[PDB]
């Protein structure tokens, strides 16, 4: 009788302490981020340290992790504005749900990929990097972002072929570590990745980039823009055209986060700026 009230007092001191740690974590920095490979819906049976405070997610959601509560539970938040911190199930917790189910029944994809804390921005299109039309249109966008997001942004040139991140292998792995590091302070990261012309080239990496498709809708327009640069550039018209066609054949919702098909620079810039400001709010709660 009076020992059932001792059991309840045990549960709720434990909840009070977990709650306290949760309150404190609000102002702690983000330690790392994950991209989810699975979905999770909180349920009473999961034994949340503070009931009502579990974080539910779908596959391909992003989580900011601040710290560990115990081996079953981390503390963090979904990367979404309005979403404040709560309890995230550890990879051990999620595997033990399966394992528990299997050990009782008898009677390999990790649930998380570690990703940069700020997804880095990679621009692809309108055609091949290394030729003038593509290099100059992208440069104008890089110049815009450096000004609009002064104080909140790191822009970096990546010359290494980081598509090989699924001698060189050393340089590539080094560039991946540097990108993770730039992102750790929660500034916007923007890559000028010289070797990346197609979203598939970064698929197997764990950069989880925001892919920006700078799209010239009309092939005739691109054809004339290239020729407008003269014979040296016009000599390589063919490689540029197929590079552009390949991008246009990508399934959009699967391949791209942002598509800039505006023919005026200011409109393309403001479309991109809107997206990145929304991403900033998602990654920077007022909590």
């Amino acid at each position: 009788s009076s020992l059932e009230e001792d059991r309840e007092a045990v549960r709720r001191e434990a909840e009070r302490q977990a709650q306290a740690q949760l309150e404190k974590a609000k102002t702690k920095p983000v330690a790392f981020a994950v991209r989810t490979n699975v979905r999770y819906s909180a349920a009473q049976e999961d034994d949340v340290p503070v009931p009502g405070m579990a974080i539910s997610f779908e596959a391909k959601d992003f989580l900011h992790v601040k710290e560990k509560f115990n081996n079953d539970w981390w503390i963090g938040r979904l990367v979404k504005e309005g979403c404040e911190i709560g309890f995230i199930p550890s990879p051990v917790k999620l595997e033990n749900m399966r394992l528990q189910h299997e050990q009782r029944a008898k009677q390999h994809t990790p649930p998380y990929d570690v990703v940069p804390s700020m997804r880095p921005v990679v621009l692809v299109g309108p055609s091949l990097k290394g030729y003038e039309v593509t290099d100059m249109m992208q440069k104008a966008l890089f110049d815009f972002l450096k000004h609009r997001f002064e104080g909140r942004i790191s822009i970096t040139r990546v010359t290494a072929d980081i598509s090989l991140a699924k001698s060189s292998l050393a340089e590539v792995q080094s560039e991946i570590e540097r990108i993770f590091e730039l992102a750790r302070t929660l500034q916007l990261v923007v890559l000028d990745a010289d070797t990346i012309n197609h979203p598939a080239q970064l698929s197997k990496t764990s950069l989880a980039p925001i892919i920006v498709y700078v799209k010239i809708s009309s092939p005739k327009v691109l054809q004339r823009l290239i020729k407008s640069r003269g014979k040296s550039q016009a000599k390589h018209l063919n490689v540029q055209m197929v590079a552009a066609d390949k991008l246009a054949q990508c399934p959009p919702q699967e391949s791209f986060d942002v598509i800039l098909d505006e023919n005026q620079l200011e409109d393309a810039c403001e479309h991109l700026a809107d997206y990145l400001e929304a991403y900033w709010k998602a990654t920077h709660p007022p909590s």
């Binding site: 327009v221 823009l225 620079l265």
Partner: peptide
């Protein structure tokens, strides 16, 4: 004038800003 000439001039101006 055509949509194509318009797009073209948009992107030619875009490119001049990088010069």
């Amino acid at each position: 004038c055509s949509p194509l000439e318009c797009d073209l001039k948009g992107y030619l101006d875009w490119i001049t800003q990088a010069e």
